[PDB]
Design a protein around this ligand. Structure first.
Ligand code: CL
Ligand code: CL
Ligand code: CL
Lengths: 98, 124, 98, 128
C-alpha cells in the first residue's frame, strides 16, 4: 500500500501559506453543522447575559454590604466623639462648679 | 508549453532545489479518476513520480477536475523520501494550471524510484 | 384580483387546532440564514464579552474609590478623637482650678 | 365517490352549519399549477357535486396540500374550517385549516357544477 505516503496529508506543512481545506460537504451536511453552531452560540449568549446580570447584582450587594460596614464603623467613632465631648463638658462644669 | 525536464532528479540530488522545490512545470501522468485520489502521478518529461496533493492544492485539483495531460506549475511543495529511502514523493500544497488537456510530452518516462534504486548514492 | 381573500391567510383562526407553518425553504435558503445567524451571534458575543470585562473593571475601580473615601472619613474622625483626647490631657496638665 | 352534495349552499344558509362547516367531503375542482413563496397557490376551487366554490388553504392545510401535490380530482374531508364572505357579502370563501385525504385523483363527480357566488347573486334573500 501507499499508506506511508498518504499519512503525510495532514503532516504540518513547512509553509505557513499552505492552508487545510476539508473535502466538500453537501448542503445537507453543512446545514446540520450550521444549525448546530447556531444552537451553541445562542446558548453561549444566554449564559453570558445571565453572567453579566449576576455580576451587576453582586456589584450592588458588595457595595451595599461595604456601605453598611462603613456606616457601623463611622457611627461607633461618632459615639466615642460624643462621649469625649461630654467628658470635656463635665470637666468644664466641674471647673466653674456646676 | 515546456516542462521542467529532469527536475524530479534535481529535487532529490541538488540541495538548493531540495530546500525549495517550487516553480517546476509538470504534466499530470495519471490520477485515480476519500484520500487516495490526492495521490497522483506527475511527469517532468524525462521522469514520472508520485505527488501527494494536500491543503489548497488538493481542493483545487478536485474542483477543477484535473487529469492526465494537464500541465501545472508547482507553487508550494516539500520533497519526501519514505520506506527506508525506497519511495519518493513530492508533497504539493499549491499549484496553478498552465495548460489543460495537453498531449503527453513523454509516454515512456522512467519511474523516479526505479532510477534511484539503481543509483542510491545520488540522493541527499 | 383575489387580494381581499388572500388577506385572510393570517386572520387568527377560530380553532385552537389550526397551527401556523412557515412556508418551505430550500436547503440553500436555510443554510444561508443559518450562516447569517452565526455571524450576528458571534458579533453579539464578542460585544457582550467586552461589556462583562468593562463591568468587572468598573467594579474594581468603584470599590477602590469607595474604600479610599471611607478610609479618608475614618482618618478624619480618628484625628478629631485624638484632638479631644489631647484637650482633656491639656486640661489635666494646666490645672485651671489654680 | 360520495361528496357532501350541496353542502356549500348549507354552509352559507344554515346557522348551525355556518358555525361548524366541518366534515364535508369535497373534490378539488381547480388549482394554480406558484412562485414558491407566494400565497396565491393556497387559493383553490373545490366541488361538493352540485356547486363549486373558492377555498383558501391556511395553516397545516396549506402546508399539506402543497407537500402532497394535491390537484383537480383529489377528494378531501375538511376537518377545520371557517366560512367567510368578503367585500360586503360579495365574495364567498371556505377558509380551510385542516383536512384529510379521502381519495387521490378520482374522476370528476361533476364537470358542469354551478359557481356558489353565481347562485347567491341570483338568490340574495337566502344568504346570511
Ligand atoms: Cl439543530
Ligand atoms: Cl497514482
Ligand atoms: Cl382557482
Amino acid at each position: 500500500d501507499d499508506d506511508d505516503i498518504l499519512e503525510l496529508v495532514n503532516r504540518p506543512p513547512m509553509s505557513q501559506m499552505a492552508v487545510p481545506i476539508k473535502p466538500p460537504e453537501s448542503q445537507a451536511e453543512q446545514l446540520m453543522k450550521a444549525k448546530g453552531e447556531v444552537g451553541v452560540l445562542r446558548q453561549k449568549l444566554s449564559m453570558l447575559e445571565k453572567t453579566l446580570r449576576e455580576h451587576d447584582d453582586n456589584q450592588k450587594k458588595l457595595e451595599s454590604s461595604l456601605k453598611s460596614s462603613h456606616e457601623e464603623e463611622v457611627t461607633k467613632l461618632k459615639i466615642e466623639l460624643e462621649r469625649l465631648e461630654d467628658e470635656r463638658k463635665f470637666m468644664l462644669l466641674e471647673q466653674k462648679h456646676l | 508549453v515546456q516542462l521542467s525536464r529532469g527536475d524530479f532528479h534535481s529535487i532529490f540530488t541538488n540541495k538548493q532545489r531540495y530546500d525549495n522545490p517550487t516553480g517546476g512545470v509538470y504534466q499530470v501522468y495519471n490520477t485515480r479518476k476519500s484520500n487516495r485520489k490526492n495521490l497522483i502521478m506527475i511527469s517532468d518529461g524525462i521522469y514520472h513520480m508520485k505527488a501527494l496533493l494536500r491543503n489548497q492544492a488538493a481542493s483545487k485539483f478536485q474542483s477543477m477536475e484535473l487529469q492526465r495531460g494537464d500541465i501545472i506549475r508547482v507553487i508550494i511543495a516539500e520533497p519526501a523520501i519514505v520506506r527506508e529511502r525506497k519511495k519518493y514523493v513530492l508533497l504539493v500544497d499549491d499549484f496553478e494550471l498552465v495548460q489543460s488537456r495537453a498531449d503527453m510530452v513523454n509516454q515512456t518516462s522512467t519511474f523516479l524510484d526505479n532510477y534511484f534504486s539503481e543509483h542510491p548514492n545520488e540522493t541527499l
